[PDB]
Design a protein around this ligand. Structure first.
Ligand SMILES: Cc1cc2nc3c(=O)[nH]c(=O)nc-3n(C[C@H](O)[C@H](O)[C@H](O)COP(=O)(O)OP(=O)(O)OC[C@H]3O[C@@H](n4cnc5c(N)ncnc54)[C@H](O)[C@@H]3O)c2cc1C
Ligand SMILES: Cc1cc2nc3c(=O)[nH]c(=O)nc-3n(C[C@H](O)[C@H](O)[C@H](O)COP(=O)(O)OP(=O)(O)OC[C@H]3O[C@@H](n4cnc5c(N)ncnc54)[C@H](O)[C@@H]3O)c2cc1C
Ligand SMILES: N=C(Cc1c[nH]c2ccccc12)C(=O)O
Ligand SMILES: N=C(Cc1c[nH]c2ccccc12)C(=O)O
Ligand SMILES: N[C@H](Cc1c[nH]c2ccccc12)C(=O)O
Lengths: 339, 339
């Protein structure tokens, strides 16, 4: 059948692939196309630091932790393959610093080697007073996008640089099912006051001697302003902002300065990191991820729509779960058609 | 008094500095010079991977462990300073893989976060079956040499490219006290059948996505013969050879191939690492480090000599301890002179 994936960010691409991988033998003509107004390096995904780490507290939608876990495993499993880095993946170990004692993350056991930092360790960071240590993964957006793309491409999924106007339009196109993976911009296709830009700017700097991530946490200053540093495949991400509702898409000087000053403070060696770029992107914020089926009817047209958006600042971290999920629904959609 | 340090590797330089740092104030006319036939990038030190980690086997002498510990601390203490990386220092976390259960290292508590790997972790490198995980430091030779050098230089220590032919000789120059830090070549100045070249060749490769060290152990094949990988400040060290008695100083193709093949197995992603260089060096092997005073008399000449050599494959790892030690003796030498 006719399937159209709207979006070419981590979400759509995975999902496209995932659906395609799982039902191309179960269905001869299984046409997949991907429509997107932006492709890497242009998506939000392309800006993401890429570290796998959910949020401190358990998700309102309890199922989401499983998605996080499944993602971590699919990733871990590729650790050992000669392709992992080509896939934009590698293990990274690091610190979560806090200014006071804090309960253990629900994912404490999903990552490798979770443990509370000792005082000697804490002295490596004179500001913080409590924290954790653990090993995890880095799944770099831009790279993963390129991989997913090559994979899809070989599987014959076709891409089109298009701005979808209305689901109707697509549907009118011929779409049988439509997978909505439009991230923060999902609103335009259908309003959702729940969804919102969680803006973040970051500085990319060249500072190879930094081998571990350090993610600082402020307790009376929202989730993002604290400075954070995340070593990636080829550069380091200096970070520190999460402004909900800001739609400004240009990097701002003060943000640049606060990020720079904050990190330089947490890691004085940055005093010599060469800055290689700055970026800003919109985390698709929503209280809970929207991943559900929805029948849209336009006259005589019976087109199904599966939503998968609102992954906030953890899209990479949870991408695979949701993908598996959409697949399951896409299956039911297929089952209702008796295949 | 006139003091002459023979050697400009990690050992001499530290020692020079260290002595100078403590008695420049106290000792009246204090004149330190460093004589060496090789300077970075030419020393053995310049080839060292730079990871702090003593041998897995217990200390040969007691002092060796304290020296190791003192070194680790002096290093840790600079973690937080904005100079550390300029000093060639940074934390690095990593794995020690074994093919069977093995007792815990005596340094288990000197490093940060020592812990036994879990099975999931073990899965990352299938061939092994047991191992550890811990965080430590990297003190890169070439860089540390340059730092020590600048420091010494500012303190006014003078350097001379020269080949000492006999302690006597140098004694003749009016040298008051000589510090022998000639590494494997210490023999020539005075025979020591205990000392021997522990040859090691390594490939430097560009593979930034590798953030942690992995040090394999073949228990039958000896120490540092198994493949090992150690991410450094700007490149990665592929390693794997420790041939005692080999004085060949040219990189050998076979070695290059076994190193390359071994690491490529342990870490398949290396398939795409660009090789940036190969190097070979002589670990100054000796059953116990030689660090002791020795009066050499030549006619009417009463010149003291303090030896500090034979640090094997753990020179960086233990440099500071020994330095502090030589200092203490140099002090006694000064005390016997009533200052
Ligand atoms: C600064 C920052 C750091 C981050 N770091 C991390 C991290 O370390 N770990 C982690 O897991 N997550 C992180 N994230 C979150 C991650 O970036 C997002 O969760 C993820 O990128 C969301 O993916 P997406 O495909 O849903 O959105 P995007 O990647 O933005 O995908 C949007 C896609 O839909 C298209 N599109 C939308 N509407 C239409 C339309 N009407 N017609 C056509 N095409 C349309 C766009 O062209 C694009 O193809 C970070 C995000 C930011 C901003
Ligand atoms: C392949 C390899 C990997 C290593 N990795 C590590 C590691 O990861 N961690 C660690 O702690 N250690 C490591 N080591 C060990 C470390 O390299 C040595 O322990 C350390 O370099 C010894 O320092 P040194 O100054 O005593 O010898 P060198 O660095 O070789 O110093 C020799 C100096 O004395 C001079 N000299 C000698 N004789 C004379 C003379 N007659 N006249 C004038 N000058 C003279 C030479 O020019 C030079 O100045 C490694 C070594 C090798 C070979
Ligand atoms: N996910 C990241 C990195 C990050 C900063 N603070 C965090 C707290 C919990 C989990 C992740 C993070 C981002 O910049 O969006
Ligand atoms: N010191 C190193 C690295 C190394 C390889 N095997 C080891 C066992 C114990 C301690 C260190 C190592 C060197 O290459 O000399
Ligand atoms: N080299 C001789 C004597 C001398 C002067 N300064 C030092 C320092 C270290 C050893 C010897 C010397 C000279 O300068 O006449």
């Amino acid at each position: 059948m006719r399937v159209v994936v709207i979006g070419a960010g981590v979400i759509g691409l995975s999902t496209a692939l995932c659906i395609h991988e799982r039902y191309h033998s179960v269905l001869q003509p299984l046409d997949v196309k991907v429509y997107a107004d932006r492709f890497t390096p242009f998506t939000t995904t392309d800006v993401a630091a890429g570290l796998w780490q959910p949020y401190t507290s358990e998700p309102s939608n309890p199922q989401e932790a499983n998605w996080n876990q499944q993602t971590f495993n699919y990733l871990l499993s590729h650790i050992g393959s000669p392709n992992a880095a080509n896939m934009g993946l590698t293990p990274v170990s690091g610190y979560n610093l806090f200014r006071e004692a804090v309960p253990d993350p629900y994912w404490k056991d999903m990552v490798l080697g979770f443990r509370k930092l000792t005082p000697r360790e804490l002295d490596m960071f004179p500001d913080y007073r409590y924290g954790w240590f653990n090993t995890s993964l880095i799944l770099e957006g831009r790279k993963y996008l390129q991989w997913l793309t090559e994979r899809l491409t070989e599987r014959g999924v076709k891409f089109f640089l298009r701005k979808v106007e209305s689901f109707e339009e697509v549907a009118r196109g011929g779409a049988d099912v439509i997978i909505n993976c439009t991230g923060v911009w999902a609103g335009v296709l259908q309003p959702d006051p729940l969804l919102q830009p969680g803006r973040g700017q970051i500085i990319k700097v060249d500072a190879p001697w930094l081998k571990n991530f350090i993610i600082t946490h402020d307790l009376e200053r929202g989730i993002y302003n604290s400075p954070y540093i995340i070593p990636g495949l080829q550069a380091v991400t200096l970070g520190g902002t999460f402004q909900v509702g800001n739609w400004n898409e240009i990097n701002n000087i003060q943000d640049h300065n606060t990020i720079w000053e904050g990190c330089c403070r947490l890691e004085p060696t940055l005093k010599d990191a060469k800055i290689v770029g700055e970026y800003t992107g919109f985390r698709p914020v929503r209280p809970q991820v929207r991943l559900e089926r929805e029948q849209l009817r336009f006259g005589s047209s019976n087109t199904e729509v599966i939503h998968n958006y609102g992954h906030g600042g953890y899209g990479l971290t949870i991408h695979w779960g949701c993908a598996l999920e959409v697949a399951k629904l896409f299956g039911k959609v297929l089952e209702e058609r008796n295949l």
